[PDB]
Paper text:
The human nucleoporin Nup98 forms fusion proteins in certain types of malignant leukaemia, is a critical component of the permeability barrier of the nuclear pore complex and is mislocalized in cytosolic deposits in Alzheimer’s disease. The most aggregation-prone segment comprises residues 85–124 (named Nup98FG85). All four fibril types display a parallel in-register β-structure comprising short and kinked β-strands.
To gain insight into the molecular organization of cohesive FG-repeat interactions, Nup98FG85 was allowed to aggregate in pure water. EM revealed the formation of well-defined and mostly separated amyloid fibrils. Using cryo-EM, we determined the structures of four different fibril polymorphs (pm1–pm4). The most common motif shared by the four polymorphs is a 13-residue β-turn/β-arch structure. A leucine-phenylalanine pair (L91-F92) is located at the tip of the β-turn, with both side chains pointing away from the turn. We obtained values of approximately −20 kcal mol–1 per chain for the four Nup98FG85 fibril structures.
Author numbering:
A (entry chain E), B (entry chain C), C (entry chain A), D (entry chain G), E (entry chain I), F (entry chain K), ...: 85 to 124
């Protein structure tokens, strides 16, 4: 109720859950994440 | 209820879940993610 | 209820789920993602 | 009720859950996360 | 009730849960997390 | 009631729960966490 | 009632729960945590 | 009622609970925790 | 009623509970904890 | 009523509870704890 | 009523409860505890 | 029931049911009256 | 019930049910009257 | 009930039910009248 | 009931039920009238 | 009941129920009238 | 009841119930009228 | 009841119930009328 | 009752109930009318 | 009752009940009318 | 009753009840009308 | 009653009840009308 981010990760190897949230009445350039070199 | 991002990742190897959320009344250039070099 | 992004990733190798969301009353150039070098 | 981020991680190996939340009436460039070198 | 971040970690090996929360009426560049070298 | 961060860690090996919370009427660059070298 | 951080740690090996909380009317650069070399 | 941090630690081996709390009307750079070399 | 930090530690081996609390009207750089070499 | 820190430690081996509390109208750099070499 | 720190220690082996409290109208660098070499 | 008034998000007033489950690697072996995994 | 008034998020007024479960590796073996995993 | 007035978050007024459970590796063996894992 | 007035967070006025449980490795063996894990 | 007035956090006025339990490795063996783990 | 007026935290006025329990390794063996672990 | 006026913390005016218990390794063996672990 | 006026901490005016118990390794064996561990 | 006026700590005016008990290794064996461990 | 005026600590004016007990290794064996350990 | 005026400590004006007891290894064996350990 709000931003509910769960993770379960059963019998896993290498699991992660990243979350960002930038709330404002005014916000100059809010990033969530930086640059990615390699993905997946 | 809101932004609900779950991950389950069963018997997995290398699982991730990235989320960004930039809410404002005014926001100059909100990125979510940077540049990707390689994907998948 | 809202933006619900789940991932399951069963017996997987290399799974990811990226999400961006830029809500505003006014937003100059909101990107979601940067440049991709290679995809898939 | 609010941002509820749980993790369960059953029989797992290498599980993590990162969360950021930048609330303001005004915020110049709030990041959530820095640059990623490799992902997943 | 507020930001409730629980973790359960049953029979696990290597589990973590990181959370940041930067509330203000005004905040110049609030990060949540620094740069990541490798993820997952 | 407020930010309630519990951890249960049953039969676990290597479990941790990090939490930061920077509340202010005004705060120049409040980080939550520093740079990460390796994650998960 | 306030920030209630409990930990249970049943039959565990290596469990920890870190919490920071920096409340102010004004605070220049309040960190919660320093740099992490390795995580999880 | 206030910040209530309990720990139970049943049949455990290596359990800890760290908490910091820096309240002020004004506080220049209040950290909670220093740098971490290895985590979990 | 105030900051109530209890620990129970039943049948345990190696249990600890650290707490800091720096209240002021003004406080230059109040840390709670120093640097950590290894955690968990 | 105030900061009530109890410990119970039943059938335990190696239990401790550390608490600091630095109240002031003004306090330059009040630490609670020094550097930790190894934790948990 | 005030800071009430009790310990019960039933059938225990190695139990301790450390408490510090530095109240002032003005106090330059009040520590509570020194450096820790190993913890838990 | 009452009205629901959102700009940027779900204004549900009806019987809104979300479910995410995983029944991965799960084996239902009933001789009689078995139901497994009913996510409505 | 009463009205719900959000700008940026779920204004639910109805019977809103969220569920996330995992039934991974779970084995239901009833002879009679077994239900397993009913996430509504 | 009464109205609910949010800018940036869930203004629930209805019967809002959140659940997260894991039934991983869990084995229900009833001869009669067994229900396991009912997350509404 | 009374109204609820938030800017940045859940203004619940209804019957808000949160639950997180884990039933991992848990084995329900009733001959009659067994329910296990009912998280509403 | 009375109104609830928050800027940055949950203004609950309704019947708000939070629960976190773990029923891990727990074995319910009733012959008759057994309920185990009812987290509402 | 009376109003509740917070800037940065939960202004609960309703019947707010928090619970955290662990029923780990716990075995309910009733012949008749057994309930175990009811965390509301 | 009377009003509650906080800046940085829980202004509860309602029936606020917190509970933390552990029922770990605990075995309820009633023949009749047994309830174990009721944390409201 | 009277009003409660805090800046940095819980201003409870209602029926605030905190409980922490442990029922670890505890065995309830009633033939009739047994309740064990009722932490409200 | 009278008002309560704190800057840095709990200004309770209501019926504030704290309890910590341990019922570890404790065995309730009533034939009739036994209650054990009622921590309100 | 009269007002309570603290800067740094609990200004209780209500019925404030603290209790800490341990019922460890304690065995209640009533045939009729036994209550053991009632910590309010 | 009269007012209570503290800077650094509990200004209780209400019915403040503290109790610490231990009922360890204690065995209540009433046939009728036994109460043991009532710490209010």
């Amino acid at each position: 109720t709000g931003t509910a981010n769960t993770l379960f990760g059963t019998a896993s190897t290498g699991t992660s859950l990243f979350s960002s949230q930038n709330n404002a009445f005014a916000q100059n350039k809010p990033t969530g994440f930086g640059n990615f070199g390699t993905s997946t």
